[PDB]
Symmetry: C6
Subunit: 220 residues, 6 copies
Amino acid sequence: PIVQNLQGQMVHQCISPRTLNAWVKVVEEKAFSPEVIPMFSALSCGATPQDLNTMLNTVGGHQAAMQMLKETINEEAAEWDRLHPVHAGPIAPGQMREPRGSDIAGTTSTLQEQIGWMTHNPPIPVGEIYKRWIILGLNKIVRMYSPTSILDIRQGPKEPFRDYVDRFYKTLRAEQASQEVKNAATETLLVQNANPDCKTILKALGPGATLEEMMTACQG
Amino acid sequence: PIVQNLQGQMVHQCISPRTLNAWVKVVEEKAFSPEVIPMFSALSCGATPQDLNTMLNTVGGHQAAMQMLKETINEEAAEWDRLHPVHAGPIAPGQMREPRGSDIAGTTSTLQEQIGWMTHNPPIPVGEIYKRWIILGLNKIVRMYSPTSILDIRQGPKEPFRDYVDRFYKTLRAEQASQEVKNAATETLLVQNANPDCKTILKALGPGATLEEMMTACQG
Amino acid sequence: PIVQNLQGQMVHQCISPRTLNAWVKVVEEKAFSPEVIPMFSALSCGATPQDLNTMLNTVGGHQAAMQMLKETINEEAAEWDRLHPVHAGPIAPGQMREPRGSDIAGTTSTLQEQIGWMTHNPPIPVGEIYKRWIILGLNKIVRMYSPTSILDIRQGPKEPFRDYVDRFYKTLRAEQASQEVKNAATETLLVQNANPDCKTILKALGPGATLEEMMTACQG
Amino acid sequence: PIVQNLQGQMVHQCISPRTLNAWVKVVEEKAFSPEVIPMFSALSCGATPQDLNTMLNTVGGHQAAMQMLKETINEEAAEWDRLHPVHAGPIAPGQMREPRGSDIAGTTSTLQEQIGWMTHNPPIPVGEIYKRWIILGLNKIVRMYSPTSILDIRQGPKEPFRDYVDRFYKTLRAEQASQEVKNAATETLLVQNANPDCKTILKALGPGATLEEMMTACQG
Amino acid sequence: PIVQNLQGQMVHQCISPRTLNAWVKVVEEKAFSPEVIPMFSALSCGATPQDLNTMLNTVGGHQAAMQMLKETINEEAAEWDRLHPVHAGPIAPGQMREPRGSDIAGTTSTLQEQIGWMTHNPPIPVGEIYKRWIILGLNKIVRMYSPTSILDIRQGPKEPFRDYVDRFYKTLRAEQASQEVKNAATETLLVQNANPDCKTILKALGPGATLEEMMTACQG
Amino acid sequence: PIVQNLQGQMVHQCISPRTLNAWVKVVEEKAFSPEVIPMFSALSCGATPQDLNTMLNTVGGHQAAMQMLKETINEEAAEWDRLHPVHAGPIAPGQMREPRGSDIAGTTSTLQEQIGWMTHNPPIPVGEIYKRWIILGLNKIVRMYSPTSILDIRQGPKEPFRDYVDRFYKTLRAEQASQEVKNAATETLLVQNANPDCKTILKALGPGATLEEMMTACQG
Ligand SMILES: CC(C)(C#Cc1ccc(-c2ccc(Cl)c3c(NS(C)(=O)=O)nn(CC(F)(F)F)c23)c([C@H](Cc2ccccc2)NC(=O)Cn2nc(C(F)(F)F)c3c2C(F)(F)[C@@H]2C[C@H]32)n1)S(C)(=O)=O
Ligand SMILES: CC(C)(C#Cc1ccc(-c2ccc(Cl)c3c(NS(C)(=O)=O)nn(CC(F)(F)F)c23)c([C@H](Cc2ccccc2)NC(=O)Cn2nc(C(F)(F)F)c3c2C(F)(F)[C@@H]2C[C@H]32)n1)S(C)(=O)=O
Ligand SMILES: CC(C)(C#Cc1ccc(-c2ccc(Cl)c3c(NS(C)(=O)=O)nn(CC(F)(F)F)c23)c([C@H](Cc2ccccc2)NC(=O)Cn2nc(C(F)(F)F)c3c2C(F)(F)[C@@H]2C[C@H]32)n1)S(C)(=O)=O
Ligand SMILES: CC(C)(C#Cc1ccc(-c2ccc(Cl)c3c(NS(C)(=O)=O)nn(CC(F)(F)F)c23)c([C@H](Cc2ccccc2)NC(=O)Cn2nc(C(F)(F)F)c3c2C(F)(F)[C@@H]2C[C@H]32)n1)S(C)(=O)=O
Ligand SMILES: CC(C)(C#Cc1ccc(-c2ccc(Cl)c3c(NS(C)(=O)=O)nn(CC(F)(F)F)c23)c([C@H](Cc2ccccc2)NC(=O)Cn2nc(C(F)(F)F)c3c2C(F)(F)[C@@H]2C[C@H]32)n1)S(C)(=O)=O
Ligand SMILES: CC(C)(C#Cc1ccc(-c2ccc(Cl)c3c(NS(C)(=O)=O)nn(CC(F)(F)F)c23)c([C@H](Cc2ccccc2)NC(=O)Cn2nc(C(F)(F)F)c3c2C(F)(F)[C@@H]2C[C@H]32)n1)S(C)(=O)=O
């Protein structure tokens, strides 16, 4: 990764074993649950495209998910070349050449070239760009590997309200969509799909009632 | 997080993997017990709004509580905006515009802005403001998810006074309350809820006795 | 905590997760045995009053012990104000204001104010003062939570001497008293409460006999 | 390893114990699965030939594979020697003689030579050259020790398409192949090996479909 | 501990949590086996008397041994005082008064005094002197708590010579002895205590044979 | 150990607890298998003779092996004195006195004297010399504690070839000898001691066939 030495110059450090293991275990333990996106984003903090590939390649199993990931990377990398045409001149001693979509993915870029792009007077972040594509690809995985649909989430007759909401938003979260789509679902289904006993209590508070006001009401 | 390098200048570092694991395991292991708020406040020492969202996003499950936490944060951001006006003047010298309540949340704010706000020569603590909002929501969650009521706590004749006293003060910690209220419950309820054999000993000690004195007297 | 950077200026660092976890586990694993006082004193090395509160607040359970702790802190904090009257003047650019008992406990002091008191040309240690009170409060807990009394410790007929002494001093240690009280007990009870077989052997060595001389004699 | 101190000069450090344990446990736990090559490449970041031999020697068992790894390394060293001639000229100024293929292996090379080669102002990467040779042998070992054949992989009617797709791409990863070959197998074999009910859905999607599209369509 | 910062000046640091856990677990796991003395000597590297007392106080249980350790330390302190006279002269310039035996123990000495003694331009090693006293007591404890006697160790005909040889040398390590005494026991007892079938082989090898030679000869 | 501070001066650091524990566990877990030599060499990286003794003394059990080790050290230390006669003059302010065999073993050398020899303008490495003897002594242990002889290694009738080779070289490795002795064994016994079915296949490839070519042929 590109960390900052005490000299204020962003230097390339080796990806710590602690970081690798943590990434391998979250994938083995938590699989592709929503909390795998934050862990990756945090464990990839300041990573070079090669550091990212390293992490992804350490993922044992889920090779299907990994292929979709490569497909999404290929997709987004094609959006980088269709929006950033290659800019061919000579080579200067001030500036780096124009990065390409494949260069960002680390396929056609070396570590030095990657490192330089991130450590540049006008910095072009190939790491954060690459990481941006990956997290999008993992959102398609979490969406896919989510068996539930928010519509299929209904409160059971003997189910505590806190549990139904935990399930409502667990499904809502995995089903990645606009915050507007996810906000409309709550105001539509959270009370509509509640069991009749608590549902009349919820209707008995008014739509402008917080989730806290809903959940404290249907306690027992 | 915004840590202080040996140069005395507050520099930004990556959230350590250890810190992530600690925050995740204290939520998995302890759930929303009162001792998770201190753990959060400690594990988020000098964290940026992006670091705080990272920790909150790593919390697998409890999505009901997490949405409640978001609602508390939204309320606090609205209050911040009403407390702090938007400013008309255009782009001033070595200065940071005032963060909006959403900027403190990091929903509308870049990490560089966050780092700049925290590292500004007259610092503005966008991360700590957000952390206060988060902690308020955590306190709401703990109180909601605490079944015990201080009035409900009572000492069985078979039960030790010290075991009952643990539960009584655990219930008082679990249920957010003003320190005076907690003292008032401690003054009146603890003896009255205690079993009569222990209670008569407590009455023998009189009002001016340490909890140690009360405990040693009922111990036998 | 207030650690020393390589610049020789005592700087405030964040309490490491390793330190927190270690404190949580010793309390969960070892509870309030005597070895919890050293672990706290060591894990609190260089801690600010807020760092201490953090640790104490992370303690899950034993809330009874925690209330006695607050009581003892309240007691000692009252001894700080009865011996250090508040000293009100203007504010200078050399020196810090006079600390108060509540300020030491972190109740009525911010981290900056705490930090400054510890990092002062004439240093006033609010951390080591606060820690001094806490360890005293934990000595009352270990004393209380010790079910045994040194008088109730007697060597069994089929009990090896090394085991009886381990129990004699295990109880002796938890029963915090003057080293003079604890020295008198040994010279009184260690041999008096030994079983008759070994007891005559001990009497057969003379009072000026080391514990080693006692324990090697009653081997088998 | 050759790490970069805060002086900007690449200095030599000892291979951390954590790094050793990680490399040993990933071989004990994962054996020679494809995910051990990335783990090796990462755990050997900036390693000297002596550090690489250290890791390889710590591998308990798999001695057949290890001897195969040695043979691959020997071949690469012979190829290096034929690529790079031995040089007649005697002992030049601030310069490093060309390493022989055995010197890159570290069999005939001192650690000081290795450190000097890597730290030379025009660096020669003796450790990275050796690491490439090692990784080639590791790839040979993984392919040999992978029982699965991409043609052998087939979807049972009972088996989920996504589970079969995992196996198919795991087998393609386990068996070293050119990326075009792997794409060719993916294009033709994946649908044909899939079970007919899923296969007819895949045929309905047509050639231009994401693996996600294929998977969601056969999912049900 | 007194560690050396990058400024070449020995600075004081806090005893790391890892170091504490290691010292506690090696006592819990290994108790007072001979291998705990090296572990202590290593875990107390460059420790102050306060750090040494911290480690000793963290030892849960074994209070008989701990009191024995205190007695050994008291004896050594008395011997130090008789070796080193108290000095009449009043308060000299950049100099440290001579520590009393109790000061080395840290019973009568402040940590600042300890740090000053160790960091004095002509250093006085109050911590290392105390550590020697502690280690002497530890050796007394190990020898007392070792049941085995080198004369008692003997090889069963069923028992392997190498297993017996392990026990023989373990017993010699467990029982503190002069190196010449241990050599004398090794020279005479090891063959004589060995079983006759192995013993006649040992006699065939003759006096001038390595323990390896003896072992390989009795091995079969 | 003697590590390099950022000032470029090799300074003596304390042996980390992580290093100790790692050495204790590899001996307890892996005993004297061949992979214990690399772990020691790596865990001893940059160690002083006292640091080495510390590690060896932490080894719980295998005291027989430990005595042979002392014997081998005594042997090699005698080769240091028979090749390096003591060189007695005065004491200078440039240079260190001539080291002795016992000084290298740490028996008759202090840490300062050891440290100085390693941190000398003309460096004389007492640590790497001592470590060189130890690893030789452990090669005699691994040889001894290896019950198998390469001659007694034969492929079973229902044994996969990969397993027989793993055993052939596992034994070959533990049986430390010249690489020439170990190379001759392979070309002699690896195919000679194969079961008849695979053996004719191996003979059917020619002696100039790699181990890979052998092992891919006898797959099934
Ligand atoms: C750092 C990177 C590491 C990141 C991130 C990042 C950036 C900004 C924010 C954010 C903060 C504060 C507010 Cl007030 C809002 C807000 N207000 S609101 C009510 O929509 O109107 N929205 N957002 C989101 C956005 F900023 F994008 F608009 C908000 C956030 C927070 C993180 C957070 C987690 C737990 C508890 C509080 C907050 N929220 C989300 O992540 C989106 N989310 N969605 C859903 C659902 F249930 F609907 F599916 C859920 C969340 C969820 F909050 F996590 C929580 C369990 C429910 N994280 S990473 C890979 O970890 O993400
Ligand atoms: C660091 C930041 C991380 C913080 C903090 C922070 C700041 C100040 C204090 C504090 C210290 C000393 C005293 Cl004497 C009082 C005192 N005396 S008083 C006015 O008469 O009641 N009050 N306070 C609290 C207040 F600051 F408000 F004054 C005191 C504290 C204390 C520290 C402390 C923990 C455990 C044992 C002793 C002390 N922790 C709490 O008190 C929390 N607690 N709550 C309850 C309730 F009531 F629920 F049962 C109980 C506790 C409890 F102590 F564990 C005990 C079993 C009862 N922590 S953070 C986000 O983690 O908070
Ligand atoms: C650092 C802070 C972290 C501390 C501390 C600190 C400061 C000084 C001393 C100390 C050292 C050497 C001597 Cl010779 C004496 C001595 N000589 S004597 C025989 O009384 O005349 N007394 N002391 C104590 C004092 F200095 F206070 F006077 C001595 C000590 C030592 C620590 C030590 C532990 C184990 C083995 C040897 C020593 N001893 C105590 O802690 C008090 N103790 N009591 C009792 C009992 F059995 F009686 F209950 C026991 C101890 C005990 F030694 F632990 C041991 C199991 C028995 N620790 S902390 C929170 O960890 O404490
Ligand atoms: C760091 C060093 C440590 C390295 C490396 C390194 C360099 C570049 C890339 C890479 C990135 C993005 C794209 Cl879009 C492609 C792409 N697209 S393409 C041309 O159409 O196929 N190819 N490559 C690979 C190549 F560089 F060759 F172009 C791509 C990579 C990728 C990173 C990556 C891992 C997982 C998920 C997404 C991405 N890892 C692999 O691909 C390995 N892999 N293999 C196979 C096969 F085929 F066996 F099934 C499969 C994978 C797999 F991705 F896991 C997935 C389930 C299929 N790693 S190291 C020694 O560890 O390697
Ligand atoms: C670092 C400080 C931390 C230290 C130390 C320190 C200093 C020097 C030495 C040492 C080195 C080499 C040789 Cl050749 C001899 C040698 N040869 S001799 C004169 O003929 O006997 N003697 N010594 C010891 C002495 F220094 F006294 F000379 C030798 C040592 C050695 C190092 C060592 C450990 C294991 C295997 C080889 C070597 N450790 C011990 O010897 C302890 N030991 N004891 C016994 C007894 F007898 F009980 F069975 C046994 C051992 C044993 F080696 F494990 C072996 C199974 C027998 N450690 S510390 C507080 O941990 O000590
Ligand atoms: C650092 C210190 C820490 C060290 C070391 C060190 C120094 C140099 C070398 C080395 C490297 C490359 C080549 Cl091509 C050859 C080569 N070519 S060859 C085919 O003989 O002609 N020989 N050597 C060895 C030597 F340089 F000494 F000549 C080679 C090595 C490598 C390490 C290595 C381990 C695993 C896989 C590849 C390599 N090999 C050995 O260690 C000796 N070995 N022996 C045997 C057997 F099976 F025969 F018993 C085996 C090995 C073994 F390779 F480990 C492997 C399981 C078989 N390690 S340490 C205490 O860890 O050792």
